[PDB]
Enzyme design. Structure first.
Site, PDB file in Angstrom:
ATOM      1  N   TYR A  34     -50.269  -5.853  62.372  1.00 53.28           N
ATOM      2  CA  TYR A  34     -49.065  -5.649  61.530  1.00 53.28           C
ATOM      3  C   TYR A  34     -48.503  -4.244  61.702  1.00 53.28           C
ATOM      4  N   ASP A  46     -47.883   2.171  57.782  1.00 56.57           N
ATOM      5  CA  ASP A  46     -49.134   1.791  58.392  1.00 56.57           C
ATOM      6  C   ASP A  46     -48.880   0.804  59.529  1.00 56.57           C
ATOM      7  N   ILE A  64     -51.411  -8.317  48.947  1.00 53.92           N
ATOM      8  CA  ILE A  64     -50.223  -8.495  48.127  1.00 53.92           C
ATOM      9  C   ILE A  64     -49.693  -9.911  48.259  1.00 53.92           C
ATOM     10  N   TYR A  90     -46.086  -4.092  45.311  1.00 50.09           N
ATOM     11  CA  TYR A  90     -46.779  -3.150  44.395  1.00 50.09           C
ATOM     12  C   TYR A  90     -45.979  -2.913  43.109  1.00 50.09           C
ATOM     13  N   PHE A 107     -42.828  -6.117  56.632  1.00 46.35           N
ATOM     14  CA  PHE A 107     -43.941  -6.176  57.553  1.00 46.35           C
ATOM     15  C   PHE A 107     -43.614  -7.130  58.693  1.00 46.35           C
TER      16      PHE A 107
HETATM   17  C1  LIG Z   1     -51.469   1.286  48.038  1.00 39.41           C
HETATM   18  O1  LIG Z   1     -52.430   2.254  47.634  1.00 39.41           O
HETATM   19  C2  LIG Z   1     -53.601   1.692  47.008  1.00 39.41           C
HETATM   20  C3  LIG Z   1     -54.673   2.788  46.984  1.00 39.41           C
HETATM   21  C4  LIG Z   1     -55.236   3.206  48.327  1.00 39.41           C
HETATM   22  C5  LIG Z   1     -56.075   2.143  48.996  1.00 39.41           C
HETATM   23  C6  LIG Z   1     -56.818   2.722  50.192  1.00 39.41           C
HETATM   24  C7  LIG Z   1     -57.665   3.923  49.788  1.00 39.41           C
HETATM   25  C8  LIG Z   1     -58.392   4.517  50.994  1.00 39.41           C
HETATM   26  C9  LIG Z   1     -56.792   4.959  49.067  1.00 39.41           C
HETATM   27  O2  LIG Z   1     -55.862   5.485  49.966  1.00 39.41           O
HETATM   28  O3  LIG Z   1     -56.044   4.352  48.004  1.00 39.41           O
HETATM   29  C10 LIG Z   1     -57.565   6.064  48.369  1.00 39.41           C
HETATM   30  O4  LIG Z   1     -57.150   7.222  48.400  1.00 39.41           O
HETATM   31  C11 LIG Z   1     -58.666   5.788  47.611  1.00 39.41           C
HETATM   32  O5  LIG Z   1     -59.748   5.733  48.195  1.00 39.41           O
HETATM   33  N1  LIG Z   1     -58.579   5.497  46.286  1.00 39.41           N
HETATM   34  C12 LIG Z   1     -57.330   5.474  45.515  1.00 39.41           C
HETATM   35  C13 LIG Z   1     -57.413   6.441  44.342  1.00 39.41           C
HETATM   36  C14 LIG Z   1     -58.648   6.167  43.496  1.00 39.41           C
HETATM   37  C15 LIG Z   1     -59.923   6.220  44.361  1.00 39.41           C
HETATM   38  C16 LIG Z   1     -59.839   5.258  45.548  1.00 39.41           C
HETATM   39  C17 LIG Z   1     -60.088   3.831  45.066  1.00 39.41           C
HETATM   40  O6  LIG Z   1     -61.024   3.527  44.385  1.00 39.41           O
HETATM   41  O7  LIG Z   1     -59.176   2.950  45.505  1.00 39.41           O
HETATM   42  C18 LIG Z   1     -59.348   1.541  45.137  1.00 39.41           C
HETATM   43  C19 LIG Z   1     -60.184   0.857  46.233  1.00 39.41           C
HETATM   44  C20 LIG Z   1     -59.409   0.759  47.550  1.00 39.41           C
HETATM   45  C21 LIG Z   1     -60.716  -0.526  45.822  1.00 39.41           C
HETATM   46  C22 LIG Z   1     -61.732  -0.592  44.681  1.00 39.41           C
HETATM   47  C23 LIG Z   1     -62.960   0.264  44.959  1.00 39.41           C
HETATM   48  C24 LIG Z   1     -64.014   0.149  43.857  1.00 39.41           C
HETATM   49  C25 LIG Z   1     -64.408  -1.299  43.627  1.00 39.41           C
HETATM   50  O8  LIG Z   1     -65.341  -1.368  42.543  1.00 39.41           O
HETATM   51  C26 LIG Z   1     -63.191  -2.143  43.304  1.00 39.41           C
HETATM   52  O9  LIG Z   1     -63.636  -3.496  43.130  1.00 39.41           O
HETATM   53  C27 LIG Z   1     -62.932  -4.211  42.126  1.00 39.41           C
HETATM   54  C28 LIG Z   1     -62.155  -2.037  44.404  1.00 39.41           C
HETATM   55  C29 LIG Z   1     -57.962   0.975  44.903  1.00 39.41           C
HETATM   56  C30 LIG Z   1     -57.434   1.246  43.522  1.00 39.41           C
HETATM   57  O10 LIG Z   1     -57.617   2.312  42.979  1.00 39.41           O
HETATM   58  C31 LIG Z   1     -56.663   0.134  42.816  1.00 39.41           C
HETATM   59  C32 LIG Z   1     -55.738   0.669  41.740  1.00 39.41           C
HETATM   60  C33 LIG Z   1     -57.644  -0.847  42.223  1.00 39.41           C
HETATM   61  C34 LIG Z   1     -57.966  -2.056  42.692  1.00 39.41           C
HETATM   62  C35 LIG Z   1     -57.319  -2.676  43.898  1.00 39.41           C
HETATM   63  C36 LIG Z   1     -59.016  -2.926  42.016  1.00 39.41           C
HETATM   64  O11 LIG Z   1     -59.666  -2.223  40.976  1.00 39.41           O
HETATM   65  C37 LIG Z   1     -58.461  -4.223  41.417  1.00 39.41           C
HETATM   66  O12 LIG Z   1     -59.557  -5.096  41.215  1.00 39.41           O
HETATM   67  C38 LIG Z   1     -59.177  -6.403  40.782  1.00 39.41           C
HETATM   68  C39 LIG Z   1     -57.714  -3.896  40.124  1.00 39.41           C
HETATM   69  O13 LIG Z   1     -58.280  -3.981  39.056  1.00 39.41           O
HETATM   70  C40 LIG Z   1     -56.254  -3.478  40.220  1.00 39.41           C
HETATM   71  C41 LIG Z   1     -55.887  -2.526  39.083  1.00 39.41           C
HETATM   72  C42 LIG Z   1     -55.337  -4.708  40.227  1.00 39.41           C
HETATM   73  C43 LIG Z   1     -53.888  -4.444  40.659  1.00 39.41           C
HETATM   74  C44 LIG Z   1     -53.072  -5.740  40.706  1.00 39.41           C
HETATM   75  C45 LIG Z   1     -53.869  -3.782  42.008  1.00 39.41           C
HETATM   76  C46 LIG Z   1     -53.431  -2.571  42.305  1.00 39.41           C
HETATM   77  C47 LIG Z   1     -53.489  -1.984  43.615  1.00 39.41           C
HETATM   78  C48 LIG Z   1     -53.263  -0.679  43.971  1.00 39.41           C
HETATM   79  C49 LIG Z   1     -53.394  -0.075  45.270  1.00 39.41           C
HETATM   80  C50 LIG Z   1     -53.304   1.205  45.608  1.00 39.41           C
HETATM   81  C51 LIG Z   1     -52.940   2.287  44.624  1.00 39.41           C
HETATM   82  C1  LIG Z   2     -57.508   2.355  54.397  1.00 35.49           C
HETATM   83  O1  LIG Z   2     -56.563   1.300  54.572  1.00 35.49           O
HETATM   84  C2  LIG Z   2     -56.613   0.320  53.529  1.00 35.49           C
HETATM   85  C3  LIG Z   2     -55.342  -0.522  53.632  1.00 35.49           C
HETATM   86  C4  LIG Z   2     -54.059   0.264  53.416  1.00 35.49           C
HETATM   87  C5  LIG Z   2     -53.897   0.844  52.025  1.00 35.49           C
HETATM   88  C6  LIG Z   2     -52.490   1.387  51.820  1.00 35.49           C
HETATM   89  C7  LIG Z   2     -51.435   0.325  52.130  1.00 35.49           C
HETATM   90  C8  LIG Z   2     -50.018   0.864  51.945  1.00 35.49           C
HETATM   91  C9  LIG Z   2     -51.666  -0.221  53.541  1.00 35.49           C
HETATM   92  O2  LIG Z   2     -51.447   0.794  54.471  1.00 35.49           O
HETATM   93  O3  LIG Z   2     -53.015  -0.690  53.693  1.00 35.49           O
HETATM   94  C10 LIG Z   2     -50.820  -1.450  53.869  1.00 35.49           C
HETATM   95  O4  LIG Z   2     -50.284  -1.516  54.976  1.00 35.49           O
HETATM   96  C11 LIG Z   2     -50.733  -2.530  53.014  1.00 35.49           C
HETATM   97  O5  LIG Z   2     -49.918  -2.464  52.092  1.00 35.49           O
HETATM   98  N1  LIG Z   2     -51.535  -3.626  53.130  1.00 35.49           N
HETATM   99  C12 LIG Z   2     -52.617  -3.727  54.126  1.00 35.49           C
HETATM  100  C13 LIG Z   2     -52.487  -5.004  54.957  1.00 35.49           C
HETATM  101  C14 LIG Z   2     -52.374  -6.234  54.068  1.00 35.49           C
HETATM  102  C15 LIG Z   2     -51.200  -6.068  53.081  1.00 35.49           C
HETATM  103  C16 LIG Z   2     -51.336  -4.794  52.247  1.00 35.49           C
HETATM  104  C17 LIG Z   2     -52.388  -5.008  51.153  1.00 35.49           C
HETATM  105  O6  LIG Z   2     -52.366  -5.932  50.382  1.00 35.49           O
HETATM  106  O7  LIG Z   2     -53.328  -4.055  51.130  1.00 35.49           O
HETATM  107  C18 LIG Z   2     -54.327  -4.132  50.055  1.00 35.49           C
HETATM  108  C19 LIG Z   2     -53.774  -3.431  48.804  1.00 35.49           C
HETATM  109  C20 LIG Z   2     -53.632  -1.930  49.027  1.00 35.49           C
HETATM  110  C21 LIG Z   2     -54.611  -3.698  47.546  1.00 35.49           C
HETATM  111  C22 LIG Z   2     -54.606  -5.121  46.988  1.00 35.49           C
HETATM  112  C23 LIG Z   2     -53.206  -5.630  46.655  1.00 35.49           C
HETATM  113  C24 LIG Z   2     -53.235  -7.027  46.022  1.00 35.49           C
HETATM  114  C25 LIG Z   2     -54.137  -7.055  44.797  1.00 35.49           C
HETATM  115  O8  LIG Z   2     -54.221  -8.390  44.286  1.00 35.49           O
HETATM  116  C26 LIG Z   2     -55.533  -6.595  45.158  1.00 35.49           C
HETATM  117  O9  LIG Z   2     -56.355  -6.674  43.989  1.00 35.49           O
HETATM  118  C27 LIG Z   2     -57.750  -6.716  44.246  1.00 35.49           C
HETATM  119  C28 LIG Z   2     -55.493  -5.209  45.745  1.00 35.49           C
HETATM  120  C29 LIG Z   2     -55.615  -3.511  50.566  1.00 35.49           C
HETATM  121  C30 LIG Z   2     -56.467  -4.468  51.359  1.00 35.49           C
HETATM  122  O10 LIG Z   2     -55.963  -5.373  52.016  1.00 35.49           O
HETATM  123  C31 LIG Z   2     -57.978  -4.310  51.276  1.00 35.49           C
HETATM  124  C32 LIG Z   2     -58.671  -4.797  52.544  1.00 35.49           C
HETATM  125  C33 LIG Z   2     -58.465  -5.068  50.066  1.00 35.49           C
HETATM  126  C34 LIG Z   2     -58.705  -4.625  48.831  1.00 35.49           C
HETATM  127  C35 LIG Z   2     -58.764  -3.172  48.447  1.00 35.49           C
HETATM  128  C36 LIG Z   2     -58.942  -5.578  47.674  1.00 35.49           C
HETATM  129  O11 LIG Z   2     -58.699  -6.915  48.063  1.00 35.49           O
HETATM  130  C37 LIG Z   2     -60.353  -5.509  47.078  1.00 35.49           C
HETATM  131  O12 LIG Z   2     -60.311  -6.239  45.859  1.00 35.49           O
HETATM  132  C38 LIG Z   2     -61.283  -5.811  44.907  1.00 35.49           C
HETATM  133  C39 LIG Z   2     -61.377  -6.064  48.061  1.00 35.49           C
HETATM  134  O13 LIG Z   2     -61.715  -7.230  48.011  1.00 35.49           O
HETATM  135  C40 LIG Z   2     -61.933  -5.116  49.112  1.00 35.49           C
HETATM  136  C41 LIG Z   2     -62.343  -5.870  50.367  1.00 35.49           C
HETATM  137  C42 LIG Z   2     -63.096  -4.308  48.528  1.00 35.49           C
HETATM  138  C43 LIG Z   2     -63.574  -3.134  49.390  1.00 35.49           C
HETATM  139  C44 LIG Z   2     -64.668  -2.336  48.674  1.00 35.49           C
HETATM  140  C45 LIG Z   2     -62.416  -2.244  49.748  1.00 35.49           C
HETATM  141  C46 LIG Z   2     -61.802  -2.164  50.918  1.00 35.49           C
HETATM  142  C47 LIG Z   2     -60.607  -1.399  51.164  1.00 35.49           C
HETATM  143  C48 LIG Z   2     -59.864  -1.313  52.322  1.00 35.49           C
HETATM  144  C49 LIG Z   2     -58.645  -0.592  52.529  1.00 35.49           C
HETATM  145  C50 LIG Z   2     -57.866  -0.518  53.602  1.00 35.49           C
HETATM  146  C51 LIG Z   2     -58.125  -1.217  54.915  1.00 35.49           C
END
Ligand SMILES: CO[C@H]1C[C@@H]2CC[C@@H](C)[C@@](O)(O2)C(=O)C(=O)N2CCCC[C@H]2C(=O)O[C@H]([C@H](C)C[C@@H]2CC[C@@H](O)[C@H](OC)C2)CC(=O)[C@H](C)/C=C(\C)[C@@H](O)[C@@H](OC)C(=O)[C@H](C)C[C@H](C)/C=C/C=C/C=C/1C
Ligand SMILES: CO[C@H]1C[C@@H]2CC[C@@H](C)[C@@](O)(O2)C(=O)C(=O)N2CCCC[C@H]2C(=O)O[C@H]([C@H](C)C[C@@H]2CC[C@@H](O)[C@H](OC)C2)CC(=O)[C@H](C)/C=C(\C)[C@@H](O)[C@@H](OC)C(=O)[C@H](C)C[C@H](C)/C=C/C=C/C=C/1C
Lengths: 116, 117
Positions: A34, A46, A64, A90, A107
């Site tokens: 992507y 990205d 998403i 988002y 995308f």
């Molecule tokens: C686009 O940017 C991302 C943040 C990125 C993702 C990639 C990483 C490098 C990173 O760049 O942040 C990063 O700097 C980072 O490592 N972060 C973000 C700042 C807090 C610390 C850390 C983190 O824990 O990220 C988090 C990390 C990636 C995943 C979690 C890690 C701990 C583990 O226990 C969790 O299991 C549940 C999953 C991302 C978040 O802080 C977001 C807010 C939270 C979640 C997705 C989950 O808690 C989810 O579980 C249902 C929720 O309850 C949420 C609120 C539901 C709603 C709809 C989703 C919101 C999504 C927001 C996404 C955001 C802002």
């Molecule tokens: C460093 O790069 C990031 C991806 C970055 C973050 C910032 C964004 C701009 C972006 O650049 O991707 C981006 O291009 C983007 O927006 N993406 C990634 C490609 C798919 C579409 C979109 C997306 O949904 O990202 C996702 C978006 C940011 C957060 C989700 C959005 C939908 C909401 O329903 C979800 O709630 C849960 C949270 C990130 C991901 O695809 C990763 C793989 C998955 C998650 C974090 C959650 O599903 C989490 O739920 C607990 C998990 O099951 C994971 C496996 C738990 C473990 C520990 C964490 C792994 C984290 C990996 C993070 C990765 C590779």
């Protein structure tokens, strides 16, 4: 061709994969390449071009909403453009450093594999 | 005084002191923060929201990596901390795509902007 949804999601088929391409359905693990852009200014935030393909389970909210909907029904080799409203991305709030509030996203997605 | 370690390897360092009576990030409160995140082994910054809308989360419920839930706890508005987070308190063996490989230490600078309730 093109499909639009009442919420503003646009799913465009850019090119078709080979006829024998495996189909992505909800619950299947898929692998994609992507490029992701902010629609407002075409700024790429990205891409995994030249990187490992991005693997996720389709239809379980791991990604998403625009992806869960937009990747569904792709066949291996297909490329789609997804134009995603905030409600399918988002939201109003936006997300972290990467995504401003109220962001339309674009995308380009290529389906690389489906695990049947 | 300004550095605390935990048995899991987390280091929490106070960089800057904010308001003396600034609202405190306590477990269960929604907090708003600015951050910079870096891969420790190569110093590559992978994300930051500096100069952008603050990041909101509910502290202490596992919505963020463990190092944040532990490390942000007890900050007051205006405080800045550096978190040195072991893989067990970050993304562990799986990592987070190519930017965060398996078994990676992370460093974050975090600034507390607000606390709601
Ligand atoms: C686009 O940017 C991302 C943040 C990125 C993702 C990639 C990483 C490098 C990173 O760049 O942040 C990063 O700097 C980072 O490592 N972060 C973000 C700042 C807090 C610390 C850390 C983190 O824990 O990220 C988090 C990390 C990636 C995943 C979690 C890690 C701990 C583990 O226990 C969790 O299991 C549940 C999953 C991302 C978040 O802080 C977001 C807010 C939270 C979640 C997705 C989950 O808690 C989810 O579980 C249902 C929720 O309850 C949420 C609120 C539901 C709603 C709809 C989703 C919101 C999504 C927001 C996404 C955001 C802002
Ligand atoms: C460093 O790069 C990031 C991806 C970055 C973050 C910032 C964004 C701009 C972006 O650049 O991707 C981006 O291009 C983007 O927006 N993406 C990634 C490609 C798919 C579409 C979109 C997306 O949904 O990202 C996702 C978006 C940011 C957060 C989700 C959005 C939908 C909401 O329903 C979800 O709630 C849960 C949270 C990130 C991901 O695809 C990763 C793989 C998955 C998650 C974090 C959650 O599903 C989490 O739920 C607990 C998990 O099951 C994971 C496996 C738990 C473990 C520990 C964490 C792994 C984290 C990996 C993070 C990765 C590779």
């Amino acid at each position: 061709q093109v499909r639009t949804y009442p919420n503003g999601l646009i799913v465009e088929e850019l090119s078709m994969g080979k006829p024998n391409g495996k189909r992505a359905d909800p619950g299947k693990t898929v692998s994609v390449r992507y490029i992701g852009k902010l629609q407002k200014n075409g700024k790429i935030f990205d891409s995994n071009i030249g990187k490992s393909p991005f693997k996720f389970r389709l239809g379980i909210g791991s990604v998403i909403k625009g992806w869960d909907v937009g990747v569904n029904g792709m066949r291996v080799g297909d490329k789609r453009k997804l134009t995603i409203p905030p409600s399918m991305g988002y939201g109003v709030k936006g997300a972290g450093g990467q995504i401003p509030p109220n962001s339309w996203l674009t995308f380009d997605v290529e389906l690389i594999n489906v695990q049947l």
